[PDB]
């Protein structure tokens, strides 16, 4: 040959086969062989303890507080409701400019809330405002695509995900993208910050997930294996593992240090897509939300299903476990949130 582009394609495929070999070197066993001697968690039957109403349309996002008591909810009625999950009372009801909100975050101090959507703008509102009503405080602009997820690091650092296939770390005050992460081919749909804020993963429509180093701005690992777009992702509570759910009706658990897929969670009776995933407090239990109005509870160690959550009357759009593990919340397209334990 001689044309460096075809030689780069050749060295690319050569690298993918070196990667497959470096993967089979550490591919000595399977998770099922390791966990065949463990005992099943038994039947887990959670029940709806609360139902939070007020929302006029299908809910798309929720986020627990650090106190495991407050949470924010987003509906396509242009609202952002803050709930007191103990008493099911609403503490604030912030109307939003754009009604097509898709994400919301909760500052670990409880001082700020975030939200964004088709406006490609992340609006921060100070809940600890000093006079009248909670209103807009900051507003981060710059993305050429729709904001799909955003999460605080502290009260002044937040990472966002957008439809321009890139992620960015922002300084909320200055509004500048302090760091840019590029490399995804399709729309990046979800991000999850490590428990130590140091790393985060992102799942895009190129059927790939990427682990990004927050402080250095480089992509550390790229995982593939799904036949469709990955829609959701979340860290294992330990910090060295994460789970993904995709449109191909399958969930997959990847490890960061082994740099390959570890386990696949699927059933031939589950055919709908998947919208949200979250680990238990110990990471032993993996909860996944399906379009079939149900929530499938997988045993994160044995890939066996341990329970079902049939309590919503429409598509479950989001879910989330408290940080203390005391309860799990589920937001669905029925304009209702349900707490389970």
């Amino acid at each position: 040959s001689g044309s460096e582009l075809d030689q780069l394609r050749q060295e690319a495929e050569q690298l993918k086969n070196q990667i497959r070999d470096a993967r089979k070197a550490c591919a000595d066993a399977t998770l099922s062989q390791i966990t065949n001697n463990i005992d099943p968690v038994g039947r887990i039957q959670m029940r709806t303890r609360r139902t939070l109403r007020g929302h006029l349309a299908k809910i798309y996002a929720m986020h627990w507080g650090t106190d495991s008591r407050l949470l924010v909810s987003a509906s396509q009625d242009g609202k952002l409701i803050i709930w007191d999950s103990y008493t099911t009372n609403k503490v604030h009801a912030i109307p939003l400019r754009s009604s097509w909100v898709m994400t919301c975050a909760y500052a670990p101090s409880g001082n700020y809330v975030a939200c964004g959507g088709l406006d490609n703008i992340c609006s921060i509102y100070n809940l600890k405002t000093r006079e009248g009503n909670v209103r807009v405080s900051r507003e981060l602009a710059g993305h050429t695509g729709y904001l799909s997820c955003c999460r605080f690091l502290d009260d002044n650092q937040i990472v966002t995900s957008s439809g321009d296939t890139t992620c960015a770390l922002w300084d909320i005050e200055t509004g500048q993208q302090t760091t840019t992460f590029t490399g995804h081919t399709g729309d990046v749909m979800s991000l999850s910050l490590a428990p130590d804020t140091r790393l985060f993963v992102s799942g895009a429509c190129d059927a790939s997930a990427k682990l990004w180093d927050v402080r250095e701005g480089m992509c550390r690992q790229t995982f593939t294996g799904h036949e469709s777009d990955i829609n959701a992702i979340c860290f294992f509570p330990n910090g060295n593992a994460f789970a993904t759910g995709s449109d191909d009706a399958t969930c997959r658990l990847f490890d960061l240090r082994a740099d390959q897929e570890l386990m696949t969670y699927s059933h031939d009776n589950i055919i709908c897509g998947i919208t949200s995933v979250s680990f238990s407090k110990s990471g032993r239990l993996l909860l996944a939300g399906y379009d079939d109005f149900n929530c499938n509870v997988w045993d994160a160690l044995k890939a066996d299903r341990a329970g079902v959550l049939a309590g919503h009357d429409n598509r479950v759009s989001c879910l989330g476990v408290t940080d203390d593990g005391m309860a799990v919340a589920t937001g669905s397209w029925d304009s209702f949130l349900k707490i389970w334990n």
């Binding site: 582009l5 780069l8 394609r9 060295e11 690319a12 690298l15 993918k16 070196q18 990667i19 470096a22 993967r23 070197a25 550490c26 591919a27 000595d28 066993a29 399977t30 998770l31 390791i34 966990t35 463990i38 968690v41 887990i44 959670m46 303890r49 609360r50 999950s85 103990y86 490399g183 480089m218 992509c219 550390r220 690992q221 790229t222 294992f236 509570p237 330990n238 060295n240 593992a241 490890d255 240090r257 082994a258 740099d259 390959q260 570890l262 238990s280 407090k281 110990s282 990471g283 032993r284 239990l285 994160a300 160690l301 476990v321 593990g325 005391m326 309860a327 799990v328 707490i339 334990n341």
Partner: protein, 56 residues
Amino acid sequence: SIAQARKLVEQLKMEANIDRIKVSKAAADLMAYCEAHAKEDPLLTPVPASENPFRE
């Protein structure tokens, strides 16, 4: 397409030169973190309704 091919090769070379651990160790650490906190997960072992703020 000349810049994206150099970028694809350099990204694959950076991601390729990582050192990976055995799956056995990854599962042993997961099992250790699991059973080290298994008795404290209310969603796995249901806690009596007395210390449940939504059941008391």
